[PDB]
């Protein structure tokens, strides 16, 4: 594919969809809900420690910067980020603690 | 006393269409692993590098 | 290959330790995928033969 000979730690976007980028966050509790779209990571970070369920959709992973930011803030291993950005692969399931 | 395993390693040549097979026969005995091949060069270079540079959990294991 | 890896996972000899037994599943699963892929490839080749047949018949018609 696009990556060949890279060490298994490099974050490359193998896909070819780079047209659009956005981030939508929907934080919903059995009481209320709050939805907002943006293109920044600072307003996405605080939801890690919120006990209420949250759904953070990063539409467009051509921006390796945002994926790296959210992965390193949410305690996501760089290998998992590489798997996210590596497009040409089988559906996978991995269980971390 | 040992576990004996026989595999084939396949190689494909571009500009032609021919499979070439090399038998690799490996025996696990008394915390050692013997390997038997017929050509120099194989497909286990990643394992060699991992053992060399303490990569992966192979070093911690038997 | 599938028989070898299934036998390596199914039933554990004293030489193989349980700690590494799940790892074999990985390669075993891999082997299964390989078979499927190879099986699929076979089908494709047959279809290729078939399409050629179709071609000549259609070509004949023309």
């Amino acid at each position, epitope marked *: 594919s696009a990556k060949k000979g890279l060490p*298994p730690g490099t974050l490359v976007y193998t896909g070819k969809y780079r047209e659009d980028f956005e981030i939508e966050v929907m934080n919903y509790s059995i009481e209320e809900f709050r939805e907002f779209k943006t293109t920044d990571v600072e307003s996405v970070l605080p939801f890690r420690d919120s006990s209420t369920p949250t759904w953070i959709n990063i539409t467009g992973i051509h921006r390796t*910067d945002v994926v*790296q930011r959210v992965g390193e803030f949410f*305690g996501i291993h760089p290998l998992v980020l590489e798997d996210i950005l590596n497009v040409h692969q089988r559906p996978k399931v991995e269980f971390f603690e | 006393n040992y576990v004996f395993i026989v595999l084939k390693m396949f190689t494909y040549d571009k500009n032609l269409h021919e499979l070439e097979s090399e038998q690799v026969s490996l025996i696990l005995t008394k915390n050692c692993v013997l390997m038997f091949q017929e050509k120099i060069g194989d497909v286990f270079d990643p394992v060699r590098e991992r053992i060399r540079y303490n990569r*992966g959990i192979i070093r911690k294991k038997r | 290959l599938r028989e070898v890896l299934s036998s390596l996972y199914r039933d554990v000899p004293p030489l193989i330790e349980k700690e590494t037994v799940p790892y074999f599943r*990985d390669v075993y699963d891999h082997t299964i995928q390989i078979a499927d892929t190879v099986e699929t490839f076979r089908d494709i080749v047959s279809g290729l033969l078939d399409v050629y047949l179709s071609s000549v018949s259609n070509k004949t018609n023309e």
Partner: antibody
């Protein structure tokens, strides 16, 4: 064989600019993460910055977020930490370190170690006065 | 909202060949991402333990690392006079890599 060294530590009048240079031998920084760590005299270690040079990703600490700027050079194979408008709290010994992790892929329960700084340079004193 | 890892004891007094344990606890579960570093006076800290249990290649096998939930411990079985230096507990799970406040082991 592999070793990191830091140079450029020097006295800076509060509000100045200063560039630290971390030169590494034995590995290419284009493929690895370079971490800048800070240690005030008598206090513990305080992580400053990190660069993943391949994607040009620069992560910073809150205390220097926007103030410092970390950037790598592959041709020179050197990681530079630029500072603008240094404050009083910035006086400390700075070190550059290489993070690493050993991993095994494939399993449904993969063994993914998290990166830990491995090789640290000798560090340099950065005094603000 | 960066993780704060509290490491205790703040100071440690011990003699040669003593079993000494320095424990650091993280506010959130950092899995097994904790590392233990040793720093000699006026020197670059060297990595003792990574992944909270594994022993680095090069360090003597004397040091040990244990994990229990959100608690991590660095243990020295037979302390040596060379091992009288500051010890730091680090997380690697989350974004700002945070160290412990430090622990200095001094001869008693």
């Amino acid at each position: 064989e592999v070793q990191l060294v830091e140079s450029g530590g020097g006295l800076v009048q509060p509000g100045g600019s200063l560039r630290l240079s971390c030169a590494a031998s034995g590995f290419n920084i284009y493929y690895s993460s370079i971490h800048w760590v800070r240690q005030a005299p008598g206090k513990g270690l305080e992580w400053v910055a990190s660069i993943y040079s391949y994607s040009g990703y620069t992560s910073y600490a809150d205390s220097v977020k926007g103030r410092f700027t970390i950037s790598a050079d592959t041709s020179k194979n050197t990681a530079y930490l630029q500072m603008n408008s240094l404050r009083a709290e910035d006086t400390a010994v700075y070190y550059c370190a290489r993070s690493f992790y050993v991993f095994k892929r494939g399993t449904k329960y993969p063994y993914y170690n998290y990166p830990a700084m491995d090789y640290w340079g000798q560090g340099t004193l950065v005094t603000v006065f | 909202s960066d993780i704060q890892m509290t490491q205790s004891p703040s100071s440690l007094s011990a003699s040669v060949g003593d079993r000494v344990t320095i424990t650091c606890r993280a506010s959130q579960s950092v899995s097994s991402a904790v590392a233990w570093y040793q720093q000699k006076p006026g020197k670059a800290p060297k990595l003792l333990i990574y992944s909270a249990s594994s022993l680095y290649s090069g360090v003597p096998s004397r040091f040990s690392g244990s994990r229990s939930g959100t608690d991590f411990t660095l243990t020295i079985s037979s302390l040596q006079p060379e091992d009288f230096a500051t010890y730091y507990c680090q997380q690697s799970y989350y974004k700002p890599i945070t160290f412990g406040q430090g622990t200095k082991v001094e001869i008693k």
